C-alpha cells in the first residue's frame, strides 16, 4: 500500500498472539514495543531517543506480522509511549520512502 | 528519489543560509533541528519522545530547501541529538511510505 503522511502511519500488528497497533517509523533503527507478554529469553539494553534514554529488554527472533506480512527479528520491549516499527523490520517488508 | 531503508534516510537541507543534514522521520509529527542561528521571533514549546520531553523554541514560516525541494513551515529548534524532518514538511514535499 502507498501510505501518505497526512495522518500518523499506523498499522496493525500481530505479535505473540496479541493484536496491537504500531507506528511505521523511518527515524528509528529498532522496533520498540510498549510493555507486553512475550516469551523466551531476553537481554537488557538501553536506547536513546528524544528526551533521553530508556531501559529495554531485547528479544531476538520474534515473529511479527505487519499488515499481514511476516517478518522475524529483534524487538525491544520497554517504556516507549507508542509501539514503533523501525528500520530493522521495515526493510523486511520491503518498505520504501518515495518523494 | 526512491529511498530504501538499509541505511538511515538522510538528506541534505538548506536552512538559514546554512547547509545541514537531517533524517526523514515518518514517526515525528514535527520538524526538530539542533540548536541554530535562526532569525526572528520564537515561542517556547514542549515536545516529547522516547526518553522523555524536551524544551524547544518554535519558529513559524521558515523556508527550508529539502533535498532541492522548497517548503515553508514550523520549525522547532532545540536539544535534539539529530536533525529531524517530520511529517509537517514531509507532506509538503509529497513524500510517501511504500510497501
Ligand atoms: C529511536 C527514536 O527514539 N527515534 C526518534 C527519532 C530520533 C530520536 C533521537 C535519536 C535519533 C532518532 C523518533 O523517530 C521516535 C518518535 C518520536 O519521538 N516522535 C516525536 C518527536 C518529534 C516531534 N515533536 O514531532 C513525536 O511525534 N512527538 C509528539 C508526540 C506523539 C506521541 N503520541 C501521543 N500523543 N500519545 C510530540 N508532540 O512531542 C516516536 C517514539 C513516536
Q: Which residues of B are catalytic?
A: 25
Query: Can you give the CATH number for the domain in which B16 is found?
Result: 2.40.70.10
Q: Is B27 helix (H, G, I), strand (E, B) or coil?
A: coil
Q: Which domain holds residue A88?
A: 1-99
Give how far the C-alpha of residue A60 lies from the chain's centroid of Cα atoms, to the nearest Å: 13
Alpha carbons B19 and B39: distance in angstroms, whole number: 16
Q: What stretches of chain B adopt beta strand conformation (E)?
A: 2-3, 10-15, 18-24, 32-33, 43-49, 52-66, 69-77, 84-85, 96-98
A97 min Cα distance to partner chain B (Å):
5
B96 min Cα distance to partner chain A (Å):
5
Check: CB of residue B47 under 8 Å from CB of residue B29: no
- Resolution of the experimental structure, in angstroms: 2.0
Pick the residue of A33, A51, A52, A82 with the most B CBs within 10 A to test the interface with B by mutation. A51
Alpha carbons A99 and B26: distance in angstroms, whole number: 13
Alpha carbons B21 and A79: distance in angstroms, whole number: 29
Contact flag A69-B8 (C-beta cutoff 8 Å): no
Q: How far is the CA of A50 from the centre of ligand 1 (A)?
A: 7
User: Which position among A25, A29, A30, A60 bears the catalytic label?
Assistant: A25
Check: CB of residue B62 under 8 Å from CB of residue B48: no
- Would the CA dihedral through A53, A55, A60, A63 be positive or negative? negative
Instruction: Please tell me the total count of domains within chain B.
Output: 1
Which one, of B35, B22, B42, lies nearest residue B84 by Cα? B22
Please name the residue that has the C-alpha cell 546554512: B18
- Would the CA dihedral through B63, B64, B69, B71 be positive or negative? negative
Q: How far is the CA of A70 from the centre of ligand 1 (A)?
A: 25
Amino acid at each position: 500500500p502507498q501510505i501518505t503522511l497526512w495522518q500518523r502511519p499506523l498499522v496493525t500488528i500481530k505479535i505473540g498472539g496479541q493484536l496491537k497497533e504500531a507506528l511505521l517509523d523511518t527515524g528509528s533503527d529498532d522496533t520498540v514495543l510498549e510493555e507486553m507478554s512475550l516469551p523466551g529469553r531476553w537481554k537488557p539494553k538501553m536506547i536513546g531517543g528524544i528526551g533521553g534514554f530508556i531501559k529495554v529488554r531485547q528479544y531476538d527472533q520474534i515473529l511479527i506480522e505487519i499488515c499481514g506480512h511476516k517478518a522475524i527479528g529483534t524487538v525491544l520491549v520497554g517504556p516507549t509511549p507508542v509501539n514503533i516499527i523501525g528500520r530493522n523490520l521495515l526493510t523486511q517488508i520491503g518498505c520504501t520512502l518515495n518523494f
